[PDB]
Amino acid sequence: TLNGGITDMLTELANFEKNVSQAIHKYNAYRKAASVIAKYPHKIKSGAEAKKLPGVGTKIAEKIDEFLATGKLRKLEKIRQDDTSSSINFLTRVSGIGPSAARKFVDEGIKTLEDLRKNEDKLNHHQRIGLKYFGDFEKRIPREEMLQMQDIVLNEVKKVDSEYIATVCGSFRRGAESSGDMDVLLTHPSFTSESKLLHQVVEQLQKVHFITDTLSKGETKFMGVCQLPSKEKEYPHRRIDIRLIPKDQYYCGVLYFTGSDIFNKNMRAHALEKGFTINEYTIRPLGVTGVAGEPLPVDSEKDIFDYIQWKYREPKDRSE
DNA sequence: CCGACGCCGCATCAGC
DNA sequence: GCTGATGCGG
DNA sequence: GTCGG
Ligand code: NA
Numbered sequence: 299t300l301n302g303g304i305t306d307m308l309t310e311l312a313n314f315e316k317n318v319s320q321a322i323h324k325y326n327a328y329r330k331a332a333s334v335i336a337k338y339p340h341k342i343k344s345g346a347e348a349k350k351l352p353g354v355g356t357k358i359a360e361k362i363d364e365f366l367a368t369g370k371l372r373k374l375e376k377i378r379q380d381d382t383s384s385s386i387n388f389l390t391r392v393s394g395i396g397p398s399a400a401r402k403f404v405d406e407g408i409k410t411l412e413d414l415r416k417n418e419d420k421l422n423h424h425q426r427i428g429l430k431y432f433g434d435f436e437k438r439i440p441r442e443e444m445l446q447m448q449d450i451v452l453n454e455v456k457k458v459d460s461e462y463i464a465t466v467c468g469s470f471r472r473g474a475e476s477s478g479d480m481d482v483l484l485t486h487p488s489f490t491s492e493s494k495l496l497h498q499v500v501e502q503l504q505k506v507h508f509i510t511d512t513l514s515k516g517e518t519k520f521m522g523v524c525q526l527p528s529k530e531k532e533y534p535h536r537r538i539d540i541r542l543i544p545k546d547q548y549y550c551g552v553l554y555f556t557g558s559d560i561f562n563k564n565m566r567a568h569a570l571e572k573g574f575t576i577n578e579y580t581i582r583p584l585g586v587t588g589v590a591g592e593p594l595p596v597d598s599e600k601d602i603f604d605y606i607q608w609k610y611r612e613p614k615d616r617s618e
Numbered sequence: 619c620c621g622a623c624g625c626c627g628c629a630t631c632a633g634c
Numbered sequence: 635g636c637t638g639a640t641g642c643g644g
Numbered sequence: 645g646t647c648g649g
Contacts, residue, residue, distance in 0.1 A: 315645090323623055327645040355646045396642050422630075424642080481644090513643090514628045521628085521643075539644085541627095578625085 300341045304348075304362055307371055308332040311361075317390040318383045320397045331358050342366075385409035393428030393435055393513070393537075394421075424513050431511075431523060434534040439477045443533065444470045446526055447480055454502045455484065462486050462499070463548065467555040473614040479537035480524070481555055485548040496520060496542040510535060518542045547579045549596050554578045561616040565608070572606045581605055 299305065312328035315321045330353040335342070342348050344366065345359030354362075365371055377383045382404055389400040392414070403409070408417055414429050421429065428435065439447075448466045455464045465471070468481040486495050500520050503509040511523040520540040526533040543551045554562060554577075569576045573584050580593035581602055596602055600610045 321645090324645055326623065327647095330646080353646065357645060394642070398641060424629075479644090516628055519627050 299336060301335050301338065303369075304342060304365060305332045305336050307361065307365055307374060308335070308358065310374060311371075313387055314377055314383065317387045317397050317400060318377075327353070328358075381409075389414075391436070392425060392432060394424030394426075395428065399425070427511050427513055427523065431535045435537060437534050439479070439536055441470065441475050441477070443526060443536075444477050444480065447524065447536070447538075450506070450508050450526075451480075451482055451503070454506060454508070455499055458498050458502050459486065461488075462495075463545075465552050467552060467557075469557070471556045471613045472558065472616055479539065482538065482540045483548065483551055483555060484540060484542050485545045486542075487545055489542065489544055490546050491544045493544075496540065499540065509538070546593070546596070549599050549602065550576070550579055550581065553599050553602055556613050556616060558617055560618045561611075564618060565606075568608065569606045574606055576602065576606075 308328045309332050312325045312332065315328060316325035331351075334351045334353045335348060338348075338351060342362065345361070345363040348354045348362050349356065349359040361371055385404045386397070386400045389395050389403055389409070390397060392411075395403070403414070403417075403420070408414060408420070411429065411432060414421065414425075418426060444466070448470075451466065452464055455462045463485050465483045466480060467483055468474075468477060468479075470477045470480070484496070484499060489495055494517070496515075496517060496519075500509060500512075500515065500522075503524070507527070508524050509522055510525050513521040513523070515522070518541065522538055523535050524538045525535045541551070541555075553565075566576050569581065570584075575582050575584055575590055581596060582593050583591040585591065594605060603610045
């Protein structure tokens with residue numbers, strides 16, 4: 299892209315803030331700067347030019363000046379070569395190893411996947427699965443495979459109980475040509491906010507050998523691993539989440555987990571101006587002093603659009 | 619100057 | 635044994 | 645690190 303040197307620099311800085319410095323708000327600051335620069339339709343000539351963008355401040359402008367003048371950043375060159383920092387940063391690519399775990403491992407001399415393989419007893423269940431599928435989890439999922447995955451999920455859900463409703467959300471629902479994982483939202487008329495269901499669906503997908511491993515599982519959220527059946531070479535293992543949501547909150551949930559994140563904030567902003575508060579679960583009216591009323595009945599995504607006097611937006615048009 | 623920056627389900631640890 | 639905190643993912 | 649009350 300037009301400013302890929304800069305945006306790669308900022309993303310690498312973001313990762314070290316999150317994984318080594320444990321400074322999550324600086325991680326997000328660098329990511330926001332990388333995003334606003336990525337959308338800038340000109341090749342940046344100076345830090346001052348970039349500082350005019352929201353999310354780029356004095357320090358990032360200085361780094362851009364150093365990068366444009368010299369082609370590198372001294373601080374990033376240094377931490378790249380740092381054995382301890384580079385190893386901590388790397389180990390967080392294992393699902394289940396966060397900044398805390400990565401630091402503890404490197405402190406005791408465990409720095410590579412091979413060290414992890416030699417030290418299984420030090421890994422919890424999630425981390426063992428993350429190590430097992432390290433390469434597969436970093437591959438993207440082509441839309442054609444997402445469609446084949448959706449076929450299986452919708453068929454098996456309906457087989458368990460034809461009154462379930464299931465919706466694959468995420469960027470797939472907005473029409474993306476590839477995905478990072480699969481996000482399934484599930485509800486059933488017997489399950490309301492006022493009124494088992496998840497277990498039966500997980501069990502059925504395990505019985506037909508679609509779900510292969512479980513990272514976590516409770517009464518309303520499943521996180522695990524699945525794999526399309528092989529004809530041929532085998533398909534990569536993929537991350538799949540399944541969320542059970544009360545029926546009266548289902549379409550707020552589908553809206554939220556379809557996104558995009560940008561579209562979500564724009565819709566929430568607009569709802570506020572019309573006197574409503576929308577979150578993942580509900581839409582509620584706000585009184586004249588800002589007191590939220592009871593959740594309003596929502597029986598489709600369009601009900602939410604109708605409340606705030608927006609024309610219905612198709613998922614494919616929810617990029618912003 | 620200084621606090622916000624999203625929040626929650628699940629696994630697991632720290633502590634009683 | 636239970637309760638609450640933390641880590642983690644997203 | 646950046647923004648803004
Ligand atoms: Na700044």
